[PDB]
Symmetry: C2
Subunit: 330 residues, 2 copies
């Protein structure tokens, strides 16, 4: 346990004139229960020698969240945070420049490719991240043929169906410019469509028993109205669109107002906000599932920046996917 | 220009000349004349009289009622039906009393294993039959695999599965919430959650929801909801407790079908309400088999001409058939 703290002292001895031996020792004990800033602070440093600034800063922030007042974590972070903020501002800059670089050609192939295949990709990825064993071809087969895929449960089918319904509602009621006000009944309807076919008793329904690192208590509603008011507040136009969507998703998944269907509706609200800010559909792929959940847990420790970097990561990845998609078109 | 095939004016002039010649041949001639002009008043009159001499009084009366409804003011039909009416009223009371006695010796049955087996078993046959009248192509064995085995039939429609499931959870709700003697009432929300149960999985957006003065629309939620209020008030009024439960259920089914309060699933909810009334008067689940679908609508047809008696005879027949299924099971 605390024995290997002397191996954080061994990476302390190595770190002075070393290469990957310090990383050899710290890899080890690091995987031996990260909780004491003693190992997380030192690992932050060893990361920093590799010019891994944001990961170091993460180790410091986590050492502080677990040990409020740990002053070596405090000082090291006070030195790392401004650079990390500059880097994140840069990342958002880049993804926006790519965004309005994207808004140039409205070919019929953009219609064809994006409108259809990114629809089926979004459905498949959102339901799949929630453990759905369906493939993309099976998902679209469900959507346009309505028959049953062999070897799959009925509830998976109903997850795909409900996701399709919720997307339809979001597009033909919440993505219109004439209705520039997001109501709370709109969120309730989005969840009712998400979970309607799979679980009719709890679709569009606020949980009574608010079970459990817990979640806000039996007073969710007023917080839902808080979310809605913040979305419709006039100061939120100054905030970066990507961080706006990420904060909405965050706010929501922390409120956790439904017994089930929270993650899908959260990704839905994120996608809605980003699409109304001129962005194409943002796809959080299933292969990155791990990191996704990972970042969210860090978000519950007081640090939303990993999740923001994740959303920017895959939004820019999707946009560049598209530019590179019709650069090989022609 | 209502024109009639010539071959039957000749068949109408011929039939006028004989009955009394031992001519069964007249019945088959008038039957071939029934297959081409089913709405011809004189053919229905004659066919009725043939049914009279053949000592099938109820069907003769039916031909008279149908001829009079098709030809308002036809006094021939008026006098013939004036002869037949009291006799068929008597016959109907005979039938109802018989069904009620058989039902009284159904409630005097003491069985342990076979009974419940059968109960759960019934539990399923009802779903299959009530959805098969609705146009569901799922087999009884497929429905049974879905509900009882948690199986799924690939290559078949997803919504058929969801209709079976919704109807099953519905019947569960009726048995374990609406038959508790602590109720003894029928609120509008009982019908509304029975509908939310019927269409919950198949169509969650409109399940448990009623179909939709500055404009001029004939349909608005307050009016349709108001008609539902009239229905439930009629159901819980004590004067309507004095009528035979079979007629109470049939009239309720008719009223609910004609109010048309939901966008879809009205027929399933109507047969379900019929079953609810029947069961609260001590009857086993009344299954209207899909093999009799025709007769079903046929009776309802006569219902819209002003005669609910064929429908009452129908639901009485199949109620006795259900009871006799349970009774013959041991």
């Amino acid at each position: 346990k605390e024995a290997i703290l002397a191996a954080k002292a061994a990476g302390r001895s190595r770190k002075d004139g070393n290469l990957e031996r310090a990383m050899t020792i710290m890899e080890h004990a690091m995987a031996l229960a990260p909780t004491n800033p003693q190992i997380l602070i030192e690992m932050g440093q060893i990361r920093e020698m590799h010019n891994e600034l944001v990961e170091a800063d993460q180790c410091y922030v986590k050492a502080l969240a677990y040990d409020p007042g740990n002053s070596e974590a405090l000082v090291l972070r006070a030195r790392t945070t401004p650079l990390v903020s500059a880097i994140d501002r840069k990342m958002l800059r880049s993804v926006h420049d790519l965004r309005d670089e994207f808004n140039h050609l409205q070919h019929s192939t953009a219609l064809r490719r994006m409108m259809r295949e990114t629809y089926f990709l979004y459905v498949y990825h959102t339901v799949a991240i929630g453990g759905n064993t369906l493939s993309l071809g099976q998902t679209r087969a469900i959507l346009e043929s309505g028959m049953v895929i062999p070897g799959k449960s009925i509830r998976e089918h109903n997850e795909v169906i409900g996701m399709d319904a919720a997307l339809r509602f979001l597009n033909c009621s919440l993505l219109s410019k004439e209705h520039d006000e997001i109501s709370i009944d709109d969120i309730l309807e989005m969840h009712r469509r998400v979970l309607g076919n799979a679980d009719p008793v709890e679709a569009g329904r606020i949980r009574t028993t608010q079970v459990y690192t817990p979640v806000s208590p039996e007073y969710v509603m007023e917080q839902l109205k808080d979310i809605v008011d913040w979305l419709n507040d006039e100061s939120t136009l100054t905030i970066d669109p990507i961080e706006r969507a990420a904060i909405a998703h965050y706010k929501l998944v922390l409120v956790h107002p439904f017994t089930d269907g929270n993650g899908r509706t959260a990704r839905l609200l994120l996608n809605l906000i980003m699409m109304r800010s001129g962005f194409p559909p943002v796809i959080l792929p299933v292969e990155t599932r791990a990191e996704y959940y990972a970042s969210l847990h860090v978000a519950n420790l007081g640090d939303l920046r990993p999740f923001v970097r994740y959303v920017a990561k895959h939004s820019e990845a999707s946009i560049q996917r598209y530019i590179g998609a019709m650069k090989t078109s022609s």
